[PDB]
Amino acid sequence: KETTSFVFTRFSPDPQNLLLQGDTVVTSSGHLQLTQVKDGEPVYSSLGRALYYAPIHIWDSNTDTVANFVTSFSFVIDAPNKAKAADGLAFFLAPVDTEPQKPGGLLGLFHDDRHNKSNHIVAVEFDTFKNSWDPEGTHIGINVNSIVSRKTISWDLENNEVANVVISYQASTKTLTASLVYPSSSTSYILNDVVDLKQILPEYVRVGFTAASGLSKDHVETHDVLAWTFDSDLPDPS
Amino acid sequence: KETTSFVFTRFSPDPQNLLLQGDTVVTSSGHLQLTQVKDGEPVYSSLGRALYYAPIHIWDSNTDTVANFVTSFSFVIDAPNKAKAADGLAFFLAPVDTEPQKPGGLLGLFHDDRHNKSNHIVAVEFDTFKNSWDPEGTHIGINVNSIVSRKTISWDLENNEVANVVISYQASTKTLTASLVYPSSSTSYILNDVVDLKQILPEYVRVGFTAASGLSKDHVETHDVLAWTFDSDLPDPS
Amino acid sequence: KETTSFVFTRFSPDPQNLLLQGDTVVTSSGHLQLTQVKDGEPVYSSLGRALYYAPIHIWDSNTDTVANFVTSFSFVIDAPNKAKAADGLAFFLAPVDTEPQKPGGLLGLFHDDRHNKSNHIVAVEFDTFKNSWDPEGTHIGINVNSIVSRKTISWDLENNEVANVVISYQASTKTLTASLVYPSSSTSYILNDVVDLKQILPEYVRVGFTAASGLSKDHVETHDVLAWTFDSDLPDPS
Amino acid sequence: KETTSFVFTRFSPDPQNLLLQGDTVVTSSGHLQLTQVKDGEPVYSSLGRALYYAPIHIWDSNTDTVANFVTSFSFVIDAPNKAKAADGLAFFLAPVDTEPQKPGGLLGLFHDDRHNKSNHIVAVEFDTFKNSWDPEGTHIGINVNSIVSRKTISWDLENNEVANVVISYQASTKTLTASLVYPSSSTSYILNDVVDLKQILPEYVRVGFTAASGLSKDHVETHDVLAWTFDSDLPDPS
Ligand SMILES: *[C@@H]1O[C@H](CO)[C@@H](O[C@@H]2O[C@H](CO)[C@@H](O[C@@H]3O[C@H](CO[C@H]4O[C@H](CO)[C@@H](O)[C@H](O)[C@@H]4O)[C@@H](O)[C@H](O[C@H]4O[C@H](CO)[C@@H](O)[C@H](O)[C@@H]4O)[C@@H]3O[C@@H]3OC[C@@H](O)[C@H](O)[C@H]3O)[C@H](O)[C@H]2NC(C)=O)[C@H](O[C@@H]2O[C@@H](C)[C@@H](O)[C@@H](O)[C@@H]2O)[C@H]1NC(C)=O
Ligand SMILES: CC(=O)N[C@H]1[C@H](Oc2ccc([N+](=O)[O-])cc2)O[C@H](CO)[C@@H](O[C@@H]2O[C@H](CO)[C@H](O)[C@H](O)[C@H]2NC(C)=O)[C@@H]1O
Ligand SMILES: CC(=O)N[C@H]1[C@H](Oc2ccc([N+](=O)[O-])cc2)O[C@H](CO)[C@@H](O[C@@H]2O[C@H](CO)[C@H](O)[C@H](O)[C@H]2NC(C)=O)[C@@H]1O
Ligand SMILES: CC(=O)N[C@H]1[C@H](Oc2ccc([N+](=O)[O-])cc2)O[C@H](CO)[C@@H](O[C@@H]2O[C@H](CO)[C@H](O)[C@H](O)[C@H]2NC(C)=O)[C@@H]1O
Ligand SMILES: CC(=O)N[C@H]1[C@H](Oc2ccc([N+](=O)[O-])cc2)O[C@H](CO)[C@@H](O[C@@H]2O[C@H](CO)[C@H](O)[C@H](O)[C@H]2NC(C)=O)[C@@H]1O
Ligand SMILES: *[C@@H]1O[C@H](CO)[C@@H](O)[C@H](O[C@@H]2O[C@@H](C)[C@@H](O)[C@@H](O)[C@@H]2O)[C@H]1NC(C)=O
Ligand SMILES: *[C@@H]1O[C@H](CO)[C@@H](O)[C@H](O[C@@H]2O[C@@H](C)[C@@H](O)[C@@H](O)[C@@H]2O)[C@H]1NC(C)=O
Ligand SMILES: *[C@@H]1O[C@H](CO)[C@@H](O)[C@H](O)[C@H]1NC(C)=O
Ligand SMILES: [Ca+2]
Ligand SMILES: [Ca+2]
Ligand SMILES: [Ca+2]
Ligand SMILES: [Ca+2]
Ligand SMILES: [Mn+2]
Ligand SMILES: [Mn+2]
Ligand SMILES: [Mn+2]
Ligand SMILES: [Mn+2]
């Protein structure tokens, strides 16, 4: 049996147990600022990611076991003009050597808009801009190897409000669940779908966040993570 | 700082750390069977509750602190005729000396359909029967001092399937969140509302379950709890 | 699988999840004061106990499993005259309906100085007074069904200093381990013994503390518990 | 607040969340085999280490906080000739970029036998060979920036038996405690000392094990870790 766990109720400068990629910085208020801010205003065409440094053991070919996990986090998206919000934030699992891909609507996760099994990506996206592959309206999506979500639900961005997210995986039912709550308005969202992690992901992955601002100057927003917990449990064989 | 925590992944036949009230028994399969079953069939006019034996310290007048908590459980409701399902199941917090109240649509929680501040009850209900005070259709409700829910959402019963529930309280925002997921159908439900526990509940409470079958012979269903975890954390001041 | 857990980093007045027996009170400084204090001075012939309210499931006859547990606590003993210290403090496990027994050197645990299997008591004692059944000098003891310890080690009371205790049970090896550290002086003590909990204790027990001051006026000391954590884990059958 | 936690009840082949250094391999029985074994016999002049991949945040200059931690592990040392056992095993904390140093009695931890503040090492050693700087007999030591222990206690190797170790740090008292239990013989050991982590170690460290066999062919032994848990908690200020 193996478990991994971590908690950040806020973030420190130079977090050596996080791998920061692209534009990500830690703010003086202790937030993970994934996309760039300049003179209090979000900057366009910005992309940042942040991964926990240790690989997570998500399944084991030796014992044919698959891990459960649960992650919680708080985030804020602040768009000066909510009608022009872009592009969004995602929580993801990827190969250990994962590097940032294309900006904008591809969210730093994918190189193009196609499905490719060699991506080995599972993600939950909080998508603020309708691209050609998207459903109508802002939405939460479960993504497997593609920016084109397996499943989505409508989600209304509450501009500059704290969102509390929980994402969990139950290996026994192969179900990934994602919920988002805005305590300020008592509004809440949830979806779940079948995702077989053993078939999608390598045995070890890195986990974390990615976010991108829009590719035109008036389609901008901030993407800040305020807090993050993660717990995984790879059980003993049957 | 004070914390309380417990886990049951199944139940043992004479659970001395649970206070069983009314008809509740533990089955040979290790389930908490809240309402009576006879020869594999649910019995009408049955009421059962089950509380954790230890009081939970949910707020402290000495330090003006309020606890967070999170509880998870799995339950099954099996109605032979889904159109005649009644009456439902609830998770609740109540005074330490709480005793079962009226059966049927009052769910063992209340003596009538009014809103009495001296009840000191907070509950999340899974309501299978439309009473005169209910919204149309089966629903999940957040209840404060009344069977008339403060907030409800529609919920479609998946008959005889395992439902996974999480209920959490965030003291800082005074918000109670409840979610239900059916992994078998990939359906999920969530709601949240403002509930100020310090104003509603005494400093110590008991926590647990209640359920009731219908008050006519053809309006019956089982209410079984399969597993239950609970964690509370009363922080230090500031 | 079943687990039980709790933490107190200090104690609140009227702790409704503790069963206080005999003279025990909670002080305004947040200590569990097991033996009586009057005008800042310890009172003789005082006996107090404190138990966690919920029974702990320590073994299960249905699945033939036995729990592991670990408890930690901090305590202070203050004797105005260290040469006349009496009688000491113990951590114990006992039947759920346990009531205080004889004061003084029997520590509220036993009715007499004999071994009796029907006591169903396991205790770790911090013994400050040499009774006729004791080894020479102040000592820590592991007791099973008798005030006459199975195993003891010498322990020098550091008067009015905080002692940090850890007591753990490993079911797989049937070993009970007890350690005490005084961080102020970097002095530490440890002992362990084979104790088969399934043979000694009922399936459910209560856990807690007991302490007694001496039965003559000049043989007195305080016994305060400052903090307490407990965790038990009853595994699934293998 | 920041926490890090992990559990291994056994080790899998190719553990990508461990940094293996020198001779370390994972065996088919799931053990961390720190020093080399050839045809069932320990090899001399062997050195191996194993570190958890993620840096641990042990103190924070921004908030002036210092972490508590607790680690538990099980290990086995098997010496074909117990009188010629060498050299031993240590648990340690070191800078994130730590690399194996000299073999033999320096345990892979140090380049020489001197005290040097720039080592930034805290270790608990299980020392099976008397070097010129050692006390008489096999011993457990607390080491700070030197192979010459700050404090030691006698320890008798129980050859090829499982030792259960717990090492904990209490920031409030700046005390490190280490205990070792052999459940097979009901033998136990403990020591503690003042170690100020903020003054010794960098803000982030790696944690893990090191072990070395003797530098002559007849002074050999195996060093296997069977299981390992670690938990750290860096609190909020105040
Ligand atoms: C809004 O919620 C409020 C809080 O629940 C309600 O107030 C409570 O209502 C209780 C009844 O439902 C009531 O308790 C009863 O007290 C009776 C006698 O009290 C005196 O005498 C005692 C000795 O007998 C003495 O020690 C006391 O100090 C009192 O001076 C007692 O006879 C009742 O017991 C009989 O009936 C119950 C069934 O309800 C049986 O369980 C019992 O065997 C017996 O046959 C009853 O006692 C309670 O019995 C169960 C036991 O576990 C409890 O510990 C015991 O208290 C209670 O006093 C009040 N509480 C307060 C703070 O007022 C309120 O109800 C209405 O208003 C009250 C004032 C009263 O008029 C009720 O009849 C009303 O229904 C709720 N309001 C509304 C509109 O619903
Ligand atoms: C027209 C313009 O000003 N900017 C548009 C930009 O145009 C140019 C013009 C010249 C050159 N060039 O290399 O010379 C390159 C790009 O082409 C971008 C790629 O199609 C538009 O990107 C879209 O921007 C949107 C916000 O407006 C969202 O961020 C949306 O997700 C994003 N689309 C994707 C697929 O990421 C972007 O709006
Ligand atoms: C057979 C029948 O019709 N039984 C019905 C019963 O009727 C009578 C008729 C005359 C008298 N009287 O002596 O004045 C007493 C009872 O009145 C009960 C109170 O309204 C009905 O209770 C309801 O039963 C439903 C299922 O049928 C649900 O369980 C529902 O939640 C429950 N209602 C409540 C408020 O709990 C019950 O169905
Ligand atoms: C005033 C006095 O002499 N009291 C003494 C008392 O005496 C009597 C006198 C008459 C009768 N009787 O059966 O009538 C019974 C007892 O006999 C006790 C022995 O049974 C002394 O108890 C011991 O006191 C010591 C401190 O002085 C320690 O507290 C010690 O642990 C304690 N011993 C025990 C076993 O609890 C107790 O001091
Ligand atoms: C085969 C033999 O006798 N080798 C011995 C070796 O001898 C020589 C002699 C001359 C030269 N030279 O540079 O010419 C090189 C090696 O000197 C080593 C340094 O003192 C002995 O190392 C000690 O070996 C012991 C077990 O025998 C323990 O492992 C002990 O911890 C270890 N000492 C240290 C400080 O690591 C080592 O035993
Ligand atoms: C062993 O302990 C139990 C309770 O812990 C006592 O009740 C026993 O007392 C003896 O048995 C009881 C039932 C009663 O008959 C009494 O007179 C006996 O002394 C006790 N056994 C002994 C031998 O002291
Ligand atoms: C303490 O350890 C460091 C880290 O390897 C050594 O470099 C130090 O050596 C001293 O400083 C170096 C730069 C060099 O000047 C050398 O001559 C010094 O000895 C070491 N310090 C000591 C005193 O041994
Ligand atoms: C999928 O990804 C691989 C690796 O980047 C690439 O070489 C391949 O051509 C992609 N598309 C396929 C197989 O259709
Ligand atoms: Ca999009
Ligand atoms: Ca109803
Ligand atoms: Ca004594
Ligand atoms: Ca040595
Ligand atoms: Mn999308
Ligand atoms: Mn309802
Ligand atoms: Mn004694
Ligand atoms: Mn040494």
mmCIF file of N, CA and C in Angstrom, chain D residues 154-226:
data_model
loop_
_atom_site.group_PDB
_atom_site.id
_atom_site.type_symbol
_atom_site.label_atom_id
_atom_site.label_comp_id
_atom_site.label_asym_id
_atom_site.label_seq_id
_atom_site.Cartn_x
_atom_site.Cartn_y
_atom_site.Cartn_z
ATOM 1 N N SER D 154 23.432 3.152 24.125
ATOM 2 C CA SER D 154 23.752 1.786 23.750
ATOM 3 C C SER D 154 22.561 1.119 23.084
ATOM 4 N N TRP D 155 22.845 0.297 22.088
ATOM 5 C CA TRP D 155 21.853 -0.434 21.341
ATOM 6 C C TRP D 155 22.450 -1.747 20.913
ATOM 7 N N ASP D 156 21.820 -2.860 21.263
ATOM 8 C CA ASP D 156 22.267 -4.177 20.829
ATOM 9 C C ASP D 156 21.530 -4.591 19.566
ATOM 10 N N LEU D 157 22.289 -4.764 18.485
ATOM 11 C CA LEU D 157 21.712 -5.274 17.241
ATOM 12 C C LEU D 157 21.069 -6.645 17.479
ATOM 13 N N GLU D 158 19.802 -6.800 17.107
ATOM 14 C CA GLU D 158 19.175 -8.131 17.087
ATOM 15 C C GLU D 158 19.206 -8.595 15.653
ATOM 16 N N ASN D 159 20.098 -9.538 15.424
ATOM 17 C CA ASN D 159 20.519 -9.851 14.088
ATOM 18 C C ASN D 159 19.380 -10.456 13.268
ATOM 19 N N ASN D 160 19.130 -9.871 12.110
ATOM 20 C CA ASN D 160 18.047 -10.289 11.224
ATOM 21 C C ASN D 160 16.608 -10.177 11.792
ATOM 22 N N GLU D 161 16.400 -9.366 12.829
ATOM 23 C CA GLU D 161 15.065 -9.107 13.366
ATOM 24 C C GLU D 161 14.584 -7.742 12.911
ATOM 25 N N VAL D 162 13.272 -7.599 12.812
ATOM 26 C CA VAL D 162 12.669 -6.336 12.387
ATOM 27 C C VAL D 162 12.743 -5.333 13.534
ATOM 28 N N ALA D 163 13.334 -4.174 13.266
ATOM 29 C CA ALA D 163 13.326 -3.045 14.205
ATOM 30 C C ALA D 163 12.303 -2.035 13.750
ATOM 31 N N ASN D 164 11.475 -1.543 14.669
ATOM 32 C CA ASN D 164 10.483 -0.517 14.370
ATOM 33 C C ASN D 164 10.971 0.787 14.997
ATOM 34 N N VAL D 165 11.222 1.780 14.149
ATOM 35 C CA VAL D 165 11.741 3.086 14.562
ATOM 36 C C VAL D 165 10.667 4.161 14.421
ATOM 37 N N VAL D 166 10.649 5.096 15.382
ATOM 38 C CA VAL D 166 9.902 6.332 15.266
ATOM 39 C C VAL D 166 10.854 7.483 15.605
ATOM 40 N N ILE D 167 10.901 8.485 14.730
ATOM 41 C CA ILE D 167 11.683 9.697 14.950
ATOM 42 C C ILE D 167 10.742 10.875 14.815
ATOM 43 N N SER D 168 10.727 11.754 15.816
ATOM 44 C CA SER D 168 9.835 12.906 15.800
ATOM 45 C C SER D 168 10.531 14.190 16.251
ATOM 46 N N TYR D 169 10.058 15.307 15.714
ATOM 47 C CA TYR D 169 10.571 16.625 16.052
ATOM 48 C C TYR D 169 9.420 17.516 16.523
ATOM 49 N N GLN D 170 9.595 18.075 17.719
ATOM 50 C CA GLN D 170 8.655 19.007 18.330
ATOM 51 C C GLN D 170 9.322 20.389 18.288
ATOM 52 N N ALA D 171 8.849 21.218 17.377
ATOM 53 C CA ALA D 171 9.409 22.554 17.133
ATOM 54 C C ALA D 171 9.345 23.453 18.358
ATOM 55 N N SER D 172 8.252 23.363 19.118
ATOM 56 C CA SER D 172 8.043 24.239 20.275
ATOM 57 C C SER D 172 9.127 24.082 21.365
ATOM 58 N N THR D 173 9.685 22.882 21.483
ATOM 59 C CA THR D 173 10.749 22.598 22.440
ATOM 60 C C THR D 173 12.097 22.318 21.767
ATOM 61 N N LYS D 174 12.145 22.399 20.436
ATOM 62 C CA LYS D 174 13.324 22.125 19.635
ATOM 63 C C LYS D 174 13.914 20.752 19.954
ATOM 64 N N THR D 175 13.067 19.760 20.202
ATOM 65 C CA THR D 175 13.569 18.456 20.601
ATOM 66 C C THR D 175 13.284 17.404 19.525
ATOM 67 N N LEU D 176 14.335 16.660 19.214
ATOM 68 C CA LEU D 176 14.278 15.477 18.383
ATOM 69 C C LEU D 176 14.281 14.225 19.264
ATOM 70 N N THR D 177 13.319 13.338 19.046
ATOM 71 C CA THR D 177 13.205 12.078 19.775
ATOM 72 C C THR D 177 13.325 10.912 18.798
ATOM 73 N N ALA D 178 14.060 9.881 19.185
ATOM 74 C CA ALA D 178 14.163 8.662 18.390
ATOM 75 C C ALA D 178 13.968 7.451 19.288
ATOM 76 N N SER D 179 13.129 6.522 18.857
ATOM 77 C CA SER D 179 12.910 5.288 19.577
ATOM 78 C C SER D 179 13.061 4.100 18.633
ATOM 79 N N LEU D 180 13.459 2.956 19.190
ATOM 80 C CA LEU D 180 13.556 1.715 18.432
ATOM 81 C C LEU D 180 12.994 0.606 19.286
ATOM 82 N N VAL D 181 12.130 -0.207 18.687
ATOM 83 C CA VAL D 181 11.529 -1.349 19.354
ATOM 84 C C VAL D 181 11.798 -2.617 18.541
ATOM 85 N N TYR D 182 12.213 -3.680 19.232
ATOM 86 C CA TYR D 182 12.210 -5.022 18.655
ATOM 87 C C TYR D 182 11.033 -5.805 19.262
ATOM 88 N N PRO D 183 9.924 -5.922 18.526
ATOM 89 C CA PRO D 183 8.756 -6.602 19.131
ATOM 90 C C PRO D 183 8.996 -8.089 19.430
ATOM 91 N N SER D 184 9.854 -8.751 18.640
ATOM 92 C CA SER D 184 10.167 -10.159 18.818
ATOM 93 C C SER D 184 10.775 -10.452 20.206
ATOM 94 N N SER D 185 11.568 -9.541 20.762
ATOM 95 C CA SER D 185 12.193 -9.748 22.069
ATOM 96 C C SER D 185 11.681 -8.829 23.191
ATOM 97 N N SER D 186 10.711 -7.969 22.892
ATOM 98 C CA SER D 186 10.201 -6.972 23.820
ATOM 99 C C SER D 186 11.320 -6.084 24.388
ATOM 100 N N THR D 187 12.199 -5.638 23.503
ATOM 101 C CA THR D 187 13.285 -4.744 23.859
ATOM 102 C C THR D 187 13.009 -3.392 23.226
ATOM 103 N N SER D 188 13.370 -2.314 23.918
ATOM 104 C CA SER D 188 13.133 -0.984 23.392
ATOM 105 C C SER D 188 14.175 0.023 23.845
ATOM 106 N N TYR D 189 14.344 1.058 23.028
ATOM 107 C CA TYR D 189 15.357 2.089 23.216
ATOM 108 C C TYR D 189 14.776 3.444 22.887
ATOM 109 N N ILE D 190 15.262 4.479 23.565
ATOM 110 C CA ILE D 190 14.816 5.843 23.262
ATOM 111 C C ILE D 190 15.889 6.862 23.643
ATOM 112 N N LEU D 191 15.977 7.945 22.877
ATOM 113 C CA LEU D 191 16.776 9.095 23.272
ATOM 114 C C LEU D 191 16.225 10.347 22.659
ATOM 115 N N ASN D 192 16.586 11.479 23.255
ATOM 116 C CA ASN D 192 16.149 12.745 22.736
ATOM 117 C C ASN D 192 17.194 13.814 23.016
ATOM 118 N N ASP D 193 17.199 14.850 22.187
ATOM 119 C CA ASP D 193 18.120 15.970 22.343
ATOM 120 C C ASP D 193 17.588 17.228 21.691
ATOM 121 N N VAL D 194 18.148 18.346 22.115
ATOM 122 C CA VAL D 194 17.836 19.638 21.549
ATOM 123 C C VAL D 194 18.560 19.814 20.218
ATOM 124 N N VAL D 195 17.798 20.070 19.173
ATOM 125 C CA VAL D 195 18.330 20.358 17.836
ATOM 126 C C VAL D 195 17.500 21.488 17.261
ATOM 127 N N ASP D 196 18.102 22.619 16.952
ATOM 128 C CA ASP D 196 17.342 23.761 16.420
ATOM 129 C C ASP D 196 17.358 23.715 14.887
ATOM 130 N N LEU D 197 16.292 23.166 14.293
ATOM 131 C CA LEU D 197 16.288 22.934 12.838
ATOM 132 C C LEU D 197 16.505 24.183 11.999
ATOM 133 N N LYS D 198 15.917 25.293 12.432
ATOM 134 C CA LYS D 198 16.075 26.571 11.741
ATOM 135 C C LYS D 198 17.536 26.996 11.622
ATOM 136 N N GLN D 199 18.342 26.730 12.651
ATOM 137 C CA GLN D 199 19.767 27.093 12.614
ATOM 138 C C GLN D 199 20.638 26.116 11.827
ATOM 139 N N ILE D 200 20.194 24.870 11.664
ATOM 140 C CA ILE D 200 21.015 23.817 11.079
ATOM 141 C C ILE D 200 20.721 23.596 9.604
ATOM 142 N N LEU D 201 19.428 23.539 9.252
ATOM 143 C CA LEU D 201 19.003 23.083 7.950
ATOM 144 C C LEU D 201 18.505 24.250 7.098
ATOM 145 N N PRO D 202 18.587 24.106 5.762
ATOM 146 C CA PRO D 202 17.899 25.064 4.903
ATOM 147 C C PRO D 202 16.376 24.930 5.009
ATOM 148 N N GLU D 203 15.662 25.899 4.456
ATOM 149 C CA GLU D 203 14.193 25.932 4.544
ATOM 150 C C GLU D 203 13.532 24.690 3.956
ATOM 151 N N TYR D 204 14.103 24.187 2.863
ATOM 152 C CA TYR D 204 13.677 22.946 2.242
ATOM 153 C C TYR D 204 14.790 21.919 2.307
ATOM 154 N N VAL D 205 14.401 20.682 2.612
ATOM 155 C CA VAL D 205 15.319 19.566 2.710
ATOM 156 C C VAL D 205 14.769 18.354 1.977
ATOM 157 N N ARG D 206 15.641 17.395 1.706
ATOM 158 C CA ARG D 206 15.188 16.050 1.390
ATOM 159 C C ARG D 206 15.435 15.141 2.576
ATOM 160 N N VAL D 207 14.579 14.139 2.701
ATOM 161 C CA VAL D 207 14.642 13.177 3.787
ATOM 162 C C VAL D 207 14.793 11.777 3.250
ATOM 163 N N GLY D 208 15.445 10.934 4.037
ATOM 164 C CA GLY D 208 15.602 9.549 3.658
ATOM 165 C C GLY D 208 16.621 8.773 4.449
ATOM 166 N N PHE D 209 17.144 7.726 3.817
ATOM 167 C CA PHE D 209 17.985 6.748 4.450
ATOM 168 C C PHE D 209 19.327 6.653 3.771
ATOM 169 N N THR D 210 20.310 6.215 4.545
ATOM 170 C CA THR D 210 21.622 5.888 4.026
ATOM 171 C C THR D 210 22.162 4.723 4.832
ATOM 172 N N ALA D 211 22.969 3.894 4.187
ATOM 173 C CA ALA D 211 23.602 2.813 4.882
ATOM 174 C C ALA D 211 24.891 2.405 4.177
ATOM 175 N N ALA D 212 25.810 1.838 4.953
ATOM 176 C CA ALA D 212 27.115 1.423 4.445
ATOM 177 C C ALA D 212 27.568 0.125 5.096
ATOM 178 N N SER D 213 28.116 -0.780 4.290
ATOM 179 C CA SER D 213 28.795 -1.967 4.806
ATOM 180 C C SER D 213 30.283 -1.651 5.045
ATOM 181 N N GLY D 214 30.959 -2.545 5.765
ATOM 182 C CA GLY D 214 32.317 -2.288 6.202
ATOM 183 C C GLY D 214 33.331 -2.254 5.087
ATOM 184 N N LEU D 215 34.451 -1.594 5.354
ATOM 185 C CA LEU D 215 35.531 -1.446 4.375
ATOM 186 C C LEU D 215 36.569 -2.576 4.392
ATOM 187 N N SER D 216 36.313 -3.649 5.128
ATOM 188 C CA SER D 216 37.083 -4.887 4.984
ATOM 189 C C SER D 216 36.108 -6.022 4.713
ATOM 190 N N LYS D 217 36.584 -7.062 4.038
ATOM 191 C CA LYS D 217 35.713 -8.117 3.493
ATOM 192 C C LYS D 217 35.007 -8.950 4.554
ATOM 193 N N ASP D 218 35.560 -9.035 5.757
ATOM 194 C CA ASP D 218 34.930 -9.802 6.829
ATOM 195 C C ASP D 218 34.031 -8.951 7.758
ATOM 196 N N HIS D 219 33.899 -7.654 7.481
ATOM 197 C CA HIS D 219 33.046 -6.768 8.282
ATOM 198 C C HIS D 219 31.848 -6.314 7.458
ATOM 199 N N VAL D 220 30.894 -7.199 7.270
ATOM 200 C CA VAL D 220 29.788 -6.927 6.337
ATOM 201 C C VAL D 220 28.437 -7.191 6.968
ATOM 202 N N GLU D 221 27.416 -6.546 6.422
ATOM 203 C CA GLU D 221 26.033 -6.796 6.859
ATOM 204 C C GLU D 221 25.105 -6.211 5.809
ATOM 205 N N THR D 222 23.879 -6.708 5.765
ATOM 206 C CA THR D 222 22.812 -6.140 4.930
ATOM 207 C C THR D 222 22.096 -5.006 5.684
ATOM 208 N N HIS D 223 21.501 -4.080 4.935
ATOM 209 C CA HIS D 223 20.698 -2.995 5.505
ATOM 210 C C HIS D 223 19.439 -2.817 4.667
ATOM 211 N N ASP D 224 18.308 -3.334 5.135
ATOM 212 C CA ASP D 224 17.054 -3.287 4.389
ATOM 213 C C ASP D 224 15.989 -2.460 5.112
ATOM 214 N N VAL D 225 15.326 -1.564 4.383
ATOM 215 C CA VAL D 225 14.142 -0.859 4.913
ATOM 216 C C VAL D 225 12.879 -1.532 4.344
ATOM 217 N N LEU D 226 11.970 -1.925 5.237
ATOM 218 C CA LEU D 226 10.786 -2.671 4.854
ATOM 219 C C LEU D 226 9.563 -1.791 4.652
#
